[PDB]
Structures are given as C-alpha cells and as structure tokens.
Structure 1
C-alpha cells in the first residue's frame, strides 16, 4: 500500500470501536494524555500519584499491590485508607494474616477507631464478607491483606484457591463498578493471583531499593513502585519515594524530588531553594523545612498538580 492520510482516520475508528466494545482503556498510546476522573484516592506520594496518571487510585476498581516481604505494600495500602477516611469515607480491612499494627496505622493518619476490621475463618468467607460490605454501598475502600493467605474451606478441613479467586472476583467485580468502592488486594511473592492479574484494573509492583540512611542507622527505605498494569492511564510508569520507619510515606520528600524534577525547586549544591527563599541545605533539612511549614509545602504540591494534572 501507499496510504498515509486516510490511515490516521481508519485507525481512529478502530480504536473508537475497541473502546466502546471493551471499555475505555482497552487500547492506548503510552504517550497519551490520561483521562481525568472526578474522584481518586491519593496515595500520599505525589510521585506515585502521577505515575498512576489520574492523581491517585481509581474508584470502583480492583487494585493489586504485589511485591516481596516488607516492601511497602501494606504501607501504601494503609495510606490509601488514611486518605479515603480523611474525606469522610469509611474503610474495611479483611485480615487473614493478623499482622496489622494500629499504632503504626494511626501514625499514618488512619482513623483506627472507625476502621472496620474483619478476620475470617476461611478464604471464601473473606471474599463473601468483602462482597457483602461492598454491596452495602457504604464502603469507600476495602483492603484485603494477603491473597496468599485466603485458604479455601476444603484445604482447611488441587487449584482450589485459583477457582476461588476467579469466582469471587467475577461477582465482586460488578458490585464495585456500581458502588464506586475500590478494593486493594495485597499479594506476596502465583496461587490465586493468576486471575487477580486479569480482573485488576491497576497492578503495582513495590520493591525495596535502598535502605535510606543518614549518619546514624537506616531511618527509612527508598521504595520503587512500578505500575505494570493501568487501565485508567498509560501503564509501565514507575515512581520512587521514602518510607520512614514509624512514619510511613514521606509526603514532603516527594514534594522535593518531584519539585526539582519540574523546575519548581532549585538545587545549588546541597542547597534546596524555592522561588526565592531557601528550604534548606540537604534533603533532610529541606524535608524538615516543609514538614513544619505546611503552608508552603501545600503550595509546592498544588503547583505540581497545576503543571501536570
């Protein structure tokens, strides 16, 4: 063929139909401008929020946060919870690991007192209780800690967990689209993950990069999240942030990094300057600066969201 102009129109149609038959996000161009939804649960890391393209987690979708032991998964999830609550939303936690430490959760901004916690007796029950809560249309965000831990009733008394997820997720997936409840599934390191991989609209890969140090010992860790699946925005985008031991995700920390990576914060050797005055000498001070000077911190957050979306 020798075509050229009529191609960008035929393709356009193709896409358009693919879009309508299988839903928005069925095909995209990695370079495409992300759609901008109304509601979205911020993750608490401006970087991860943009890597997600929509500023936060989508609603009414199943999210999957997988990765190895102590990567930041539960942290990231607990944050998405602390934000859903901040907006006056109610959350639930389906515990099948019995490892949730509220003291920490509270420090992140979680209204632990109002947190609906469940601890099922079988993997089926877990999803059932999940579904039932979901359908009430009262929940905003539901976190199910560990897919690996939802053992079927049978085993508790041959690919059972696989079938279990499949069915469970088939049913649950519809109720979510109609309730606007986003559900997060934590995954270790794949059992029933085989299907979750497909039902999931967003799939994040969290891994621990470096053990953040500063003179003394490791006061935190540098986490790297990679969205390997994103049906709401072009996928394959990654982000890095710091989780300080006991503190969680350093918000300001992202403000700085994301700040300089957008020309909003100058770096003149150890010094972090922001449109005139100085923030501090050394990322930590800069960090500390923003944490006690919330006002400006918010200013920087606002300006990056104004510069991208």
Structure 2
C-alpha cells in the first residue's frame, strides 16, 4: 500500500467510532494530552495527581489501590477522603479489616466525627451496604477496606453443595456490575483497597477505571531513625489519561503524605525551583539547605507553598 495521508484520516474514524460505543478512553496514544474534568479528588500529592493525568481521582469511577502490606494505600485512600471531605463532601468507610486509627486519620485531615463508618458481618452485606449508601446520591467518596476480607455469607457459615469455590469472584462480579451503574450515575467514586491479584481481583481488575500499584521504595532516613517512607505508585490502568505513569512521594510516620515535599520534588523537575547544591532556591530568595529544611520551610511559609503548587498546575494542570 503506497498510502500515507488517507491513513491518519481513516484511523481517526476508527478510534472515533471505537469511543462512540465503548467509551472515550477505549483507545489512546501514550503521548496524548490528557482530557480534563471539573471535579477530581486531589490525592494530597501533586506528583501522583499529575500521574493520574486528570490531576486527582475521578468521580463516578471505581478506583483500585493494591500492593504489599504497609505500602501506603490506606494513607493514599484516607487522603482522598480528607480532600473529598474538605470540599463539603461526605464520605463513608466500609471496614472489613477493623484496622483504622482515627488519630492518624485525623492528622491527615479526615473529619472522622462526620466520617461514616460501617463494619459488615459478611462480604455481601458490606457491598450491599455500600450500594444503597451509594444510590442515595449523597456520598462523594466511599472506600472499602480489603477486597480480600469480604468473605461471602456461605464460607462464613457452612457452605453449600450446589457449586462453590470462588464465591468471592461472583460476589464481586455480581456486585461490581450492579454498582458500576450507580457509581458512574451519581458522581460517587469508590476506592477498593487490595492486599497484594487473584483474590476477588479479576472482577475488579476489569471494572476498575484506575488501578494503582503502591509499594514502598526505601525507608526514608533522617539523620535520626525513620521519619517516613518513599512510596512509589504506578497507575497500571487509567481510562482517563494515558496509563503506565508513575510517581513517588514521602509518607512521614504519623504525619501522612508530605504535600510540601512533593511541591519541591516536582518543583525542581519543572524548573520552578533550583538546586544550587544542597541549596534549594526559588525565583530569587532561598528556600533552604537540604530537602527537609526546604520542606520545613514550605510547611510554615504556607503562603509560598501554594504559589509553587499553583504554578505547576498552570504549567501542566
């Protein structure tokens, strides 16, 4: 085929016709600029926000965060909550692990007091409770802790002959379908924490519109012991912007995600902040000597912090 121009035009209608029936994120080029909506739940880390493309989590979708135990998910999730919350939004927390610490959550910015919590007996109850709580069209964000802890009724009792094995993947399958509808039809985004899959996974893997692979990189040293960690997240799936994009941020013990720290790391890799060796400078005057001093600077001089964060959004968005 001695073609050339008439190709790019035909390929247009291809994609064009693909999206028209399968959705707008069905086909993409890893290079495509990202589409951008009105609502988006900031994750609390400008780095990851600019790796999700839309600058934060997508409403009306189902998000999946998975990875080793003690990676960062619940933090990354609780943050999403604090944001959705600080915008006058209401959130619920479906607990199947019984491992939430409000003091921490509160430090991150969660308004625990008005944080709706639920602790289901069986897995179905947990998902059925999340359903209506979703159909009310009142919740902004809902997070189910552990897709691996939602044991079906059967297993929880004595089981049945009929045909068992793989009761979750079904409990999930069924659930996910009935739910997907109410989600992308109410504007409530739902987060599913997965503990490192094949569990109830499969189902979710596909329904999920954004899949996050969270993992700890190093144990952030601090001259002393260990303030926080160096988490690395990678959107393995993302129907809202080109996927396979990754980000890294710090999680200070008891402090949570270091917004400021991200402000700096993104700052330098965007030319807005300079590095005169150990020295962190920003458009003239100095920020400090060493990322921590820098961070410690931004944390209090919160007035400038916002300036920098503001500009990075005018630079990429």
TM-score by length of 1: 0.99
Q: How many residues align?
A: 309
1:119-159 CA-partner distances (Å, limit 9, x unpaired):
00000000000001000000000000000000000000901
Alignment of 1:256 with 2:264, yes or no, is yes
Specify the SS of the correspondent of 1:51.
coil
Q: 1:280: how far off?
A: 0.2
Q: 1:191: how far off?
A: 1.2
Q: Deviation above 3 Å: which 4+ runs of structure 1? A: none
Q: What is the alpha-carbon distance in structure 2 between the residues aligned to residue 193 and residue 179 of structure 1?
A: 24
1:79-112 CA-partner distances (Å, limit 9, x unpaired):
0000000000000000000000000000000000
1:191-239 CA-partner distances (Å, limit 9, x unpaired):
1111100000000000000000111001100000000000000000000
Residue 79 of structure 2 is matched in structure 1 by 79
Within 5 Å, which residues of 2 pair with 1:1-309? 1-156=1-156, 158-189=165-196, 190-309=198-317
Specify the SS of the correspondent of 2:185.
helix
Q: What is the alpha-carbon distance in structure 1 between the residues aligned to residue 166 and residue 39 of structure 2?
A: 37
Q: 1:283: how far off?
A: 0.3
Specify the SS of the correspondent of 1:290.
helix
Computed over aligned residues only, the root mean square deviation of the Cα atoms, in angstroms, reads 0.8
Q: 1:115: how far off?
A: 0.2
TM-score by length of 2: 0.97
1:29-75 CA-partner distances (Å, limit 9, x unpaired):
00000000010000000000000000000000000000010000000
Specify the SS of the correspondent of 1:225.
strand
Q: What is the alpha-carbon distance in structure 2 between the residues aligned to residue 233 and residue 68 of structure 1?
A: 25
Q: What is the alpha-carbon distance in structure 2 between the residues aligned to residue 132 and residue 280 of structure 1?
A: 51
Gaps in structure 1 of 5+ consecutive residues: none
Q: 1:307: how far off?
A: 0.2
Q: What is the alpha-carbon distance in structure 1 between the residues aligned to residue 35 and residue 4 of structure 2?
A: 28
Q: What is the alpha-carbon distance in structure 1 between the residues aligned to residue 89 and residue 21 of structure 2?
A: 33
1:157-192 CA-partner distances (Å, limit 9, x unpaired):
901000110000000000001110000000002211
Q: What is the alpha-carbon distance in structure 2 between the residues aligned to residue 71 and residue 15 of structure 1?
A: 37
Q: What is the alpha-carbon distance in structure 1 between the residues aligned to residue 118 and residue 244 of structure 2?
A: 33
Q: 1:14: how far off?
A: 0.1
Q: 1:16: how far off?
A: 0.2
Q: What is the alpha-carbon distance in structure 1 between the residues aligned to residue 83 and residue 284 of structure 2?
A: 32
Q: What is the alpha-carbon distance in structure 2 between the residues aligned to residue 266 and residue 97 of structure 1?
A: 44
Q: 1:257: how far off?
A: 0.3
Q: What is the alpha-carbon distance in structure 1 between the residues aligned to residue 171 and residue 62 of structure 2?
A: 16
